[PDB]
Amino acid sequence: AFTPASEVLLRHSDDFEQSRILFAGDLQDDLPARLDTAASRAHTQQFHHWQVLSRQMGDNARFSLVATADDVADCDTLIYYWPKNKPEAQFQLMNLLSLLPVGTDIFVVGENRSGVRSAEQMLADYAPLNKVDSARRCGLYFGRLEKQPVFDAEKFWGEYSVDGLTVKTLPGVFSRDGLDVGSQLLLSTLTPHTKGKVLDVGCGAGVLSVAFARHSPKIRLTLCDVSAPAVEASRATLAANGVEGEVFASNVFSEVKGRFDMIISNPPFHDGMQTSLDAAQTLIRGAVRHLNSGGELRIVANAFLPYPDVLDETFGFHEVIAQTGRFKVYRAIM
Numbered sequence: 001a002f003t004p005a006s007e008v009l010l011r012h013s014d015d016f017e018q019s020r021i022l023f024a025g026d027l028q029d030d031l032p033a034r035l036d037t038a039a040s041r042a043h044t045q046q047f048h049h050w051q052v053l054s055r056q057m058g059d060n061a062r063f064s065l066v067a068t069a070d071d072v073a074d075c076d077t078l079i080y081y082w083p084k085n086k087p088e089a090q091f092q093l094m095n096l097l098s099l100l101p102v103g104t105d106i107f108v109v110g111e112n113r114s115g116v117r118s119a120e121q122m123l124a125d126y127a128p129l130n131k132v133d134s135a136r137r138c139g140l141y142f143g144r145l146e147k148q149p150v151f152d153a154e155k156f157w158g159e160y161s162v163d164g165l166t167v168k169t170l171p172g173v174f175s176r177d178g179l180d181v182g183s184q185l186l187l188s189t190l191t192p193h194t195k196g197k198v199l200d201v202g203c204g205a206g207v208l209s210v211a212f213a214r215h216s217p218k219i220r221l222t223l224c225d226v227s228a229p230a231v232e233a234s235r236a237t238l239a240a241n242g243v244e245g246e247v248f249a250s251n252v253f254s255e256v257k258g259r260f261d262m263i264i265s266n267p268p269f270h271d272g273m274q275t276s277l278d279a280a281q282t283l284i285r286g287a288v289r290h291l292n293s294g295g296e297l298r299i300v301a302n303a304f305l306p307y308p309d310v311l312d313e314t315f316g317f318h319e320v321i322a323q324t325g326r327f328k329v330y331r332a333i334m
Contacts, residue, residue: 001031005081005109008138009035016079019105022072024096025081025089026110032079033057041075043067045092045172045228048251063249065170065228066153067092072099082110082139086118087171088229091156093119097126098151108141116141125149157236162207165214168236169205172229175268176204182266182327183208186300189322189329194219196261199290201252201283203227206234208266210241221245224256253286263287264298270305280310284332288314291334300329 001010006029009016013036020039023032027049032042033056042061044050050063062071078100083089097106106127110116116139120129127145134140158169162179169177186208194216200209203225213219223234223245235247250256265283270276284307287297297315300322301307307330311318315332322329 001034002029003031004135004138005111006031008109008134008140009079009107011134012132012140016077019077020075021077021079022075022096022100023079023081024067025092026083027053027081030056032061039074041072043071043096047226047228047249048254049226051251051254063228065232067095067099069099072096075100075104077105077107078145079107079109082108082114082116082119084114085171085174086115087156088174089115089118090122091153091171093122094149094151095153097123097145098148100145100148102145102148104145106141106143106145108139110139112137112139159240163211165207165210166237166240167205167207167233168240169233170229172227173205173233176202176230176266177207177233178205179207179211180266181324182300183211185322185324185327186264186266186298186329187211189298189331190216192216194262196220196295197259197292198222199224199256199260199263201225201263201265202267203230203234203247204266205230206237206245206247208264209234209245210237210243212264213241213243213245222256222260223247224250226251252282253290256286256290259290259292260295261292262296262298263291266300269302273306277306277310280306284310284314287332288334293334295334297332298329300327302326303328 018038021037023042027044053061108119123129126147126149127143129141129143132140192215195218197220199222203223231249238245311332318332320328321331
């Protein structure tokens with residue numbers, strides 16, 4: 001399996017061979033489907049990861065905000081891939097450890113730069129962890145579950161108000177649940193009393209959608225995101241603001257059916273160049289397939305990323321309708 005975290009595990013292949021493993025956390029590659037095990041299961045809060053894993057693992061791979069007793073059954077080992085954000089890791093480990101049997105082996109693998117060291121303290125009172133020698137930038141930890149924590153997902157819900165808008169959010173929407181500067185720029189280009197079917201692809205907690213609906217109450221909304229927390233947060237946020245709309249999980253346009261008058265998105269900032277290019281291609285190439293005649297695709301994103309070229313390639317040309325010191329709002333028409 002591809003990732004450095006999975007390479008780490010691969011260096012201890014022999015130990016997982018007779019194990020009945022549950023894989024969870026940031027399941028970036030398909031090691032959960034390939035690792036030689038007595039049995040393998042997975043639970044993820046990411047739709048695209050579930051797509052990949054269930055293709056090979058069927059019902060042994062599950063997707064949902066909250067893992068359940070059944071999702072975890074007949075597993076004597078947990079291999080958890082540490083996520084980038086701590087509240088997400090807390091939510092997931094309490095959820096998972098609260099259901100697995102006392103005695104389950106716990107393995108935690110991640111990157112020091114992503115805060116994997118925080119796991120020790122986090123699990124100190126439940127499953128005492130010890131570091132296993134690994135590559136210098138990687139953290140590999142092991143321990144047995146001694147005491148199950150008590151978990152109640154409802155206590156992790158957050159709620160706040162910004163610009164007269166109520167926002168409900170959950171761990172796992174770590175910088176995409178607010179009225180960020182990029183969102184503000186995108187919003188400034190939308191005119192009041194706009195009409196049509198819309199579709200907000202990079203979902204988040206739905207702040208963009210409820211702010212759009214506030215001045216254009218007739219728009220007909222569809223929201224999608226890969227993250228279960230984002231799907232849950234958005235529905236709650238729409239409801240909390242008297243806004244109707246359909247929200248569902250999707251790997252970009254994988255579950256989107258139909259055409260729209262406008263597609264908007266505030267993608268996350270990429271990391272590399274390839275990850276960035278791919279993300280730009282998928283968004284744009286999927287867009288031409290879901291736009292009514294004369295419909296518009298609108299994207300706000302850092303100017304450094306590769307959207308302009310992808311835009312020209314797909315639509316022939318595009319416009320920069322709004323700009324700041326970092327962001328550009330790109331517009332392309334059907």
